[PDB]
Amino acid sequence: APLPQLRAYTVDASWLQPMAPLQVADHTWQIGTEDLTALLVQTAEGAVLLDGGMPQMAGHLLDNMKLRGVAPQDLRLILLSHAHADHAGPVAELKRRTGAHVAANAETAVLLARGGSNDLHFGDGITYPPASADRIIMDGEVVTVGGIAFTAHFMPGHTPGSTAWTWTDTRDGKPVRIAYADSLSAPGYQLKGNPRYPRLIEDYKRSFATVRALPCDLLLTPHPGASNWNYAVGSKASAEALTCNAYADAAEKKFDAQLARETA
Amino acid sequence: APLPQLRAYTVDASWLQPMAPLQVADHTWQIGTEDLTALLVQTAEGAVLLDGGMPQMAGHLLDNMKLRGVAPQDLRLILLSHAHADHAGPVAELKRRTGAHVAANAETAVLLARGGSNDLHFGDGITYPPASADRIIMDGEVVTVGGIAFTAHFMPGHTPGSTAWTWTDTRDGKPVRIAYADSLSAPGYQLKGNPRYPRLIEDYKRSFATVRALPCDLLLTPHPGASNWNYAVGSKASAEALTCNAYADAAEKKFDAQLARETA
Amino acid sequence: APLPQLRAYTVDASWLQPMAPLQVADHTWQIGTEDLTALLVQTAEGAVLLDGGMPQMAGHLLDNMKLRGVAPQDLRLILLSHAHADHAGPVAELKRRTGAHVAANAETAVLLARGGSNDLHFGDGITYPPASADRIIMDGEVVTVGGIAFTAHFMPGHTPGSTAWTWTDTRDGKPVRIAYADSLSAPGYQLKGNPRYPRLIEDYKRSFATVRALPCDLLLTPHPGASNWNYAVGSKASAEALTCNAYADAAEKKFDAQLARETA
Amino acid sequence: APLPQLRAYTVDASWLQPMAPLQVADHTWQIGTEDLTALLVQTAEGAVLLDGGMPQMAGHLLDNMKLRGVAPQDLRLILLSHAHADHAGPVAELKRRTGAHVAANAETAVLLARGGSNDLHFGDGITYPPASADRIIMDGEVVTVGGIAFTAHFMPGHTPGSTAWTWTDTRDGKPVRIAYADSLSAPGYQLKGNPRYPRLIEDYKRSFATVRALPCDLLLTPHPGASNWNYAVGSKASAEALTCNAYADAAEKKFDAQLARETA
Ligand SMILES: [Zn+2]
Ligand SMILES: [Zn+2]
Ligand SMILES: [Zn+2]
Ligand SMILES: [Zn+2]
Ligand SMILES: [Zn+2]
Ligand SMILES: [Zn+2]
Ligand SMILES: [Zn+2]
Ligand SMILES: [Zn+2]
């Protein structure tokens, strides 16, 4: 009876279903897959990428970036919601082939540094190639690239370094406040009495109140299903999208129910 | 047609076949599997571990260490041949549960830091949890733990940081010079004109001459099949073991043949 | 007119005034200088060191550790209040000569990783040799060494990774709750509208309330003057020591006054 | 008698004497000081910087880069001879304000990672802000930026990661082979029997033979005095510059004399 072989991280097929760049705002484009959000922001001095998806998506992101007339050297910054395999996967490969820098908080940086290994809840089950953060950002810090200001809002919970990113774009000249809120889920997490995360419940609670007060007109999430986005129906993707109030309220209801049945 | 799922690193069953501690010398014990070498050296001030095997072997190494009366806190140093998934796998987990330090050269340290990702020949196919080296050793540097001196001999080839470790133990009072030579293989490596490793051929050549002149009475390798060690037959494991001269000569013949058919 | 020469970090003479190990509790010893706190905790399975002082203090700490019968290999863990040059200075040298591990939060780890460079308020004026944290701890996480449980309490302010450490020792069999609270000062810090630390004021406020509710019978600080400790008068050092209530209240008064005159 | 205060790294005044960009070739410009070489290469897709000088030179390099019409975001790559305080000083600050990447070998990367601390010969006397290498290069590896190919030649000695950089530029349409050879000196180094660098003498010897066979028409060094460059006399700076043969031969004579008097 030998030791078991290593198990690879396998996801649903729609998570790896490539799609053409779908326009969100005047300068905001979704270049990920049908069920994984990878946001591209085109400015006059470069491009900004928020998240990247699975590790095997690095080639697809460069193809859609070239579709938008963005050379690899035009990508200047990589922002992250949280450093998990399904969102920070291709960050290491993207840094090598584009010459871009990565801005993340300290908790996302140390999780990105060990490639997701030794996760607080998943252990070593979701390991991806490690990457190093070049600039450490704080809560409420502003990151400006080409005249577009990105404000970070810490919302710990899913990961200690979970971060919501807000920035104001336009839609035919009229401003639209966009909020990229991280996941508020806790799949299989032990919430009560977790020795690796003692104040996990308190962090989730303040994170729910943080998402509610976000300057938002249009909301996006790393997983489009959490915000009722349908990336496959083209221009009607934001038809039934949720607000920040409905997103945090529905997430808190699933959290309180999970906490109740975890006690019993 | 979605993107392909991630593929896990799977090895032969005998590579993960656990075995009881087999004695090599007075203070040297093999605690790995039947086809993967993990060496333990018991001194008066602590224990030294050379290599670790696959990532899923961290629990087995601690069990055999406790079999030898070595608590986790007694492990003081972790030496490596090269930082690949099948030899430096459990290093990250071993550092967390034992409180030991890792000594490796600069090239093995940077490969250990990114968990084997972005390999010169394998890319991201063999990723393991990353670990940080605590002390950088040079060629010919002596590392002493509890009166047993470990001398490092750089032999680049399989990896740029491939290292042979030599130390003198005893066998009922009589000294035995032990050489732990790294792998001299190049499975699927592009030898001629490799842009990621231009002087690969020259490094392999000087590495063959390095293994030949090693102070050795008993030779061991990360893979016991390369040195004709049979870990399964108990005390007759070193029956038909090779010398350093025969090991480097047979490895060079397979290298020259690989180089000849690669040209054509 | 050439560019100015580099300026070294120079402190008061009493900060580098070596002293003999002064006993704080049954297992707690102060082994730093007269004006810099370096705490040593002797257990049955090893020793724990909290802070280290200035970088040039690594030799003095080992001498006092040997005075207490603690060999370098007996030091197992290094805890930190915050990663500044006057408290985490010798951490890099202590890790090389003792074989110990460093436990710190993510914000202290990234500050320790760059040796205090690129400080939020000091820039590159207080650079010390960099060191790597081996274990990342969270708020309220318990670290046990030899039966003595260390609980971490995050108190951001002086640095984002400022941490108070609490542990229960004895005094001739009777328990004493010891709290090692980090500095609550802000020397020269820009509090209002700081772009590198937007929520600095809010973090200081919750940190004041955190220090107040600490399980404490005897309080210690990295700088003994902040807690009215007099390390030079021997056994009467804790004569006029402050409580956690008086320490946080007096620190908040100096913070509100600093904030008022900063506005004007 | 308190412990001594920290000593800052102080150099000659001419090492920090700023100068205007002096032209070396069609695309090569010297933008450092009068006695410290900082090379800038202007291509069609970006700029390349070789070395940077002292840590306090980051502002001067950006001013001369803006003098050449190179914005911070135009700097794409930073190459290094060796990671010492007087040559890799401003690398950390340059990476934050320019968005450039650093290419160095493994030995230069680990020395750059700890900011020059724990030097093989200098200890912690020459510490500078740490920086992380983004791409690890090998011996003979080609790095191309904007059509200009940079070939790295390892020449260990001064530091284990000492690297000579060669690239072919033009001079009014006619090609000129430029070699940027690292320092071949050993000031105060213990050459014979050094436990931190056992094969130091053998590495210096092969490094002398490496510099001799460099594809070179015009030679430059990190310190212009070693190559008889006079940065202050304008266009006649390369008047009495040495060849690669004379540079390595004169350096070997000073090495053999140092070795002889070190023995006695
Ligand atoms: Zn996730
Ligand atoms: Zn997810
Ligand atoms: Zn291998
Ligand atoms: Zn192998
Ligand atoms: Zn401080
Ligand atoms: Zn201080
Ligand atoms: Zn130097
Ligand atoms: Zn120099």
Marked catalytic residue, from B27, B153, B180, B189:
B189
The strand pair at A148-154 and D28-30 is best described as: unpaired
What is the CB neighbour count within 10 angstroms for residue B18?
17
What is the CB neighbour count within 10 angstroms for residue D231?
20
- CA–CA separation, C122 and C187 (whole Å): 10
How many whole angstroms from its chain centre is CA C41? 14
Q: What would the two tokens of residue C220 be?
A: 């210690």
Contacts of D142 in chain B (CB under 8 A): 195
Q: Which residue has the tokens 């990113």?
A: A165
Residues of D marked as binding?
82, 84, 86-87, 158, 223
- With residue C257 as reference, give the H or E element that holds it: helix C244-263
Q: Which residue has the tokens 């340290």?
A: B109
Resolution in A: 2.2
Enumerate residues 51 to 110 of chain D having a beta carbon within 8 A of any beta carbon in chain B.
106-107, 109-110
Q: CB-based burial of residue A5 (10 Å sphere; 0-12 exposed, 13-18 middle, 19+ buried)?
A: middle
What's the number of CA atoms in the CB half-sphere (13 Å) around residue A162?
A: 23
- CA–CA separation, D149 and C70 (whole Å): 56
Strand residues in chain D grouped as ranges (E): 22-23, 28-30, 39-42, 47-50, 75-79, 101-104, 135-136, 142-145, 148-154, 163-171, 174-180, 218-220
Q: CB-based burial of residue D82 (10 Å sphere; 0-12 exposed, 13-18 middle, 19+ buried)?
A: buried
First to last CA, chain B: 37
Range of the domain at A254: 1-264
Given an 8 Å threshold on Cβ–Cβ distance, is D46 in contact with A73? yes
Say what angle helices B200-212 and B244-263 make with each other, to 10 degrees: 160
What is the CB neighbour count within 10 angstroms for residue B238?
18
Given an 8 Å threshold on Cβ–Cβ distance, is A73 in contact with D73? no
Residues of D marked as binding for Zn(2+)?
82, 84, 86-87, 158, 223
Q: What would the two tokens of residue B247 be?
A: 């090991």
Neighboring chains of B (3 or more beta-carbon pairs < 8 A): A, C, D
Neighboring chains of C (3 or more beta-carbon pairs < 8 A): A, B, D
Q: Domain total for chain C?
A: 1
Mutate to test the interface with B, among D110, D144, D162 (most CBs of B within 10 A): D110
Marked catalytic residue, from A27, A60, A87, A153:
A87
Tell me whether residue C158 is annotated as binding. Answer: yes
* Whether D87 is catalytic: yes
SS3 label, residue B238: coil
The strand pair at D47-50 and D75-79 is best described as: parallel
- CA–CA separation, B8 and B25 (whole Å): 36
Marked catalytic residue, from B86, B119, B169, B182:
B86
CA nearest to D8, candidates C57, C60, C126: C126
C-alpha Rg value of chain D to the nearest Å: 18
Q: CB-based burial of residue D247 (10 Å sphere; 0-12 exposed, 13-18 middle, 19+ buried)?
A: buried
Nearest Cα residue in chain B from A9: B6
C-alpha Rg value of chain B to the nearest Å: 18
- CA–CA separation, C101 and C76 (whole Å): 6
SS3 label, residue B50: strand
- Dihedral angle of Cα C66, C71, C72, C76, to the nearest 10 degrees: -120
CA nearest to B163, candidates B213, B207, B101: B207
Q: What would the two tokens of residue C196 be?
A: 């590198």
What's the number of CA atoms in the CB half-sphere (13 Å) around residue D46?
A: 21
